[PDB]
Design a protein around this ligand. Sequence first.
Ligand SMILES: CCCCCC/C=C/CCCCCCCCCC(=O)O[C@H](COC(=O)CCCCCCCCCCCCCCC)COP(=O)(O)OC[C@@H](O)CO
Ligand SMILES: CCCCCC/C=C\CCCCCCCCCC(=O)O[C@H](COC(=O)CCCCCCCCCCCCCCC)COP(=O)(O)OC[C@@H](O)CO
Ligand SMILES: CCCCCC/C=C\CCCCCCCCCC(=O)O[C@H](COC(=O)CCCCCCCCCCCCCCC)COP(=O)(O)OC[C@@H](O)CO
Ligand SMILES: CCCCCC/C=C\CCCCCCCCCC(=O)O[C@H](COC(=O)CCCCCCCCCCCCCCC)COP(=O)(O)OC[C@@H](O)CO
Lengths: 52, 256, 191, 191
Amino acid sequence: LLIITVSGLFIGLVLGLQGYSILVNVGSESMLGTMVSLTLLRELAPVVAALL
Amino acid sequence: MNTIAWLGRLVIERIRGIGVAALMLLQIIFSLPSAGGFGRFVYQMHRVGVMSLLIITVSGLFIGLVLGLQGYSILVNVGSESMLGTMVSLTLLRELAPVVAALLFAGRAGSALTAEIGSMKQSEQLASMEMIGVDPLKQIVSPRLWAGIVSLPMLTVIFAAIGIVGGKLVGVDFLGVDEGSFWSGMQNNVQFGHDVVNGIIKSIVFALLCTWIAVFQGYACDPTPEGIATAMTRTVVYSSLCVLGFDFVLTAVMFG
Amino acid sequence: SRTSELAVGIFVIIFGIALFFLAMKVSGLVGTNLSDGYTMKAQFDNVNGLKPRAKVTMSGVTIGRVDSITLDPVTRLATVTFDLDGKLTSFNAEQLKEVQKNALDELRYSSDYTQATPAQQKTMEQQLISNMNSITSIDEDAYIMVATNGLLGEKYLKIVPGGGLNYLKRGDTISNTQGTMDLEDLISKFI
Amino acid sequence: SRTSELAVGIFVIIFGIALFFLAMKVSGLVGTNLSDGYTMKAQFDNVNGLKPRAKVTMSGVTIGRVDSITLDPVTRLATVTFDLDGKLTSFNAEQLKEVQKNALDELRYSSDYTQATPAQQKTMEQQLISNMNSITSIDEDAYIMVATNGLLGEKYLKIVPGGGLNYLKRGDTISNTQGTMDLEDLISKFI
Ligand SMILES: CCCCCC/C=C/CCCCCCCCCC(=O)O[C@H](COC(=O)CCCCCCCCCCCCCCC)COP(=O)(O)OC[C@@H](O)CO
Ligand SMILES: CCCCCC/C=C\CCCCCCCCCC(=O)O[C@H](COC(=O)CCCCCCCCCCCCCCC)COP(=O)(O)OC[C@@H](O)CO
Ligand SMILES: CCCCCC/C=C\CCCCCCCCCC(=O)O[C@H](COC(=O)CCCCCCCCCCCCCCC)COP(=O)(O)OC[C@@H](O)CO
Ligand SMILES: CCCCCC/C=C\CCCCCCCCCC(=O)O[C@H](COC(=O)CCCCCCCCCCCCCCC)COP(=O)(O)OC[C@@H](O)CO
């Protein structure tokens, strides 16, 4: 429970920092919560939690 | 307060463990080279680098296949399927190829370094080498440290190269985007100094952390058959937290 | 060193629980309060795309949120209720005296001296007790409208101030509105 | 063992918290529950992009969802069935009287009194007793259209009321439609 909790927080910090830089140039910073939640829920949270 | 005292005693021995591993690293990298030490380094490039070549090649192809399949579904609804090669190459070069190749290096080549050094300690080859008059930090530990710092940045470049080849294979050759627009959009937005060299600078920082942890846990092991196995799962946990922790710090500097 | 193990053991448990109380605060669960928020309401004719917990701005700066949107199926109007802030829309103490004497001196000018009775400053006494209790910065002839935040933004409410002698009280209803503009109706409106 | 069963019970508390946050803060799950909703259907000539479980709005307020879209290859017009609501679209006790007296007044005004025979208002009471058995808010010359929110968003159905005296029953067919407008539709309009 301790490796999974801290690794999930560090990955969400990188997703919100990288995803803001993409979306702010096309005028869609309101879609930040959509791309953060949909990247985790369908790609990154099943795969990275299975590698740890 | 019986477990509260146990919890405080636990994190003090872990703080003291970082102090031993810091003084162990400064004793390796600040010393003169010796006789026959290059040939021991080329032997450990075979055990650390060449043995990891099959997990890295197949895992890079499978990840590039998912990126070209998911990235086509996003871009086709906004009329920008020509930017598929830009988003596939820029996702690997700055995020995924430094990080995922360091999580498979900590599992295969990191956990095998702390089992080889740890079984030398149990069977008393490290104590027998010391009483002969040879420092085992120079003979045994120091070729294994340098072979991991060199082999992981050489393996994320092969990781990123097959990820782009795998993403071109599903995008161009199966989903049917234009081949000339795949490479021309990539050669326009991807820079060498800002995107390719910044991915190599990440994987040198990760190779130092993943190998210094793996080498320390085998040297400061507990020479007991389930004291070695407790150490092998400590190099996979501590390296994965350090890779994901230093990844946020390096993107906030490079791409922030 | 048993006193040392007890201090590092306590600091870890305190830090671990205080992160959990901070994680439930930045996650939209329990908490999420606001600086003495009162509640206004308004009635539009088309609120298409406005969702609850949206944003309310006066001059670009967010002053509130949106609470609920309901339909009245006898008169074909939508009724939005939203909740504002006290630190951003209410005069603390001093500005209360300042907008008192500006609305008093503008009312008691040479235009309304001849219109009203010559027993003046009696309406200044009656209007001042109605000013002090529960007044906001939204004057009587401002209007609210549904805006769209650039070109790909979400949707939100915008209060456009203008004019104003008397003000609206906390709880009132803004009676100058204009709803949104659908892009199907834009092209048509054109030709 | 009493600790290990106590610690596993905390691992099920934190799992239940996270499944609560994922379902009812991140997804649309808690906001899909319709109150005694009936079912209507319309028939279009272009439903391209309309998905099931899409949205139905009247004035910007969501009043239903979309259930099923099929061809009917004998007439080759697509048929959408959608289910509306009880509260936001059907009348109640006070409102039914408020439309029953005016539906006789819109009928038996000065204009359409001497349009039927010289008989009494029992047939104009028949137009009252034809009403209250399962009426809606939608009249008979409202139209429905496949609109799109924003200019890169999803597609939903939009009910636009207008004019009209009588009211549709629960379960009928709205008979004025217009389908989607894609890029080749927008061009042929302007020329
Ligand atoms: C708006 C500006 C746009 C950017 C313009 C840049 C244009 C692109 C050109 C070149 C790319 C420059 C980007 C910054 C480079 C990051 C440097 C860095 O991150 O430095 C790394 C520090 O890493 C660690 O300690 C982890 C510690 C991280 C904290 C270090 C803080 C760095 C502060 C100095 C860096 C100056 C940044 C200059 C960029 C503006 C060292 O990397 P290595 O050489 O491998 O050392 C090997 C290690 O084992 C150390 O022994
Ligand atoms: C910015 C400055 C440089 C960046 C480094 C910064 C880090 C701090 C300084 C590091 C260098 C200090 C020099 C001292 C190095 C100390 C390590 C050392 O000296 O290790 C030596 C190994 O040889 C060895 O250099 C290992 C042999 C060479 C290893 C590296 C090989 C380089 C080849 C790849 C280089 C990449 C370039 C490619 C570019 C595209 C000696 O080990 P042993 O012989 O087995 O001992 C055994 C006996 O004592 C008893 O049995
Ligand atoms: C432009 C794009 C750039 C891209 C560049 C190209 C990328 C690289 C391309 C190809 C890389 C291929 C990887 C080669 C792996 C070499 C591994 C190796 O060579 O290691 C060997 C063993 O490998 C072993 O286990 C044998 C290892 C397992 C064998 C594999 C078995 C699985 C395959 C069979 C199943 C078929 C697959 C299913 C398909 C339907 C060494 O033998 P050892 O006895 O251990 O050591 C002996 C020493 O003491 C002295 O010699
Ligand atoms: C809405 C959003 C939803 C999100 C929901 C919330 C998410 C979950 C929240 C929090 C989860 C916290 C994780 C708790 C970890 C519990 C681990 C545990 O409880 O395990 C214990 C040991 O942990 C141990 O090693 C002690 C483990 C190491 C201690 C940690 C030390 C690092 C911290 C100190 C440094 C501070 C950090 C630096 C900050 C600047 C058990 O002890 P054992 O002796 O091994 O077994 C005993 C058995 O035989 C019988 O009892």
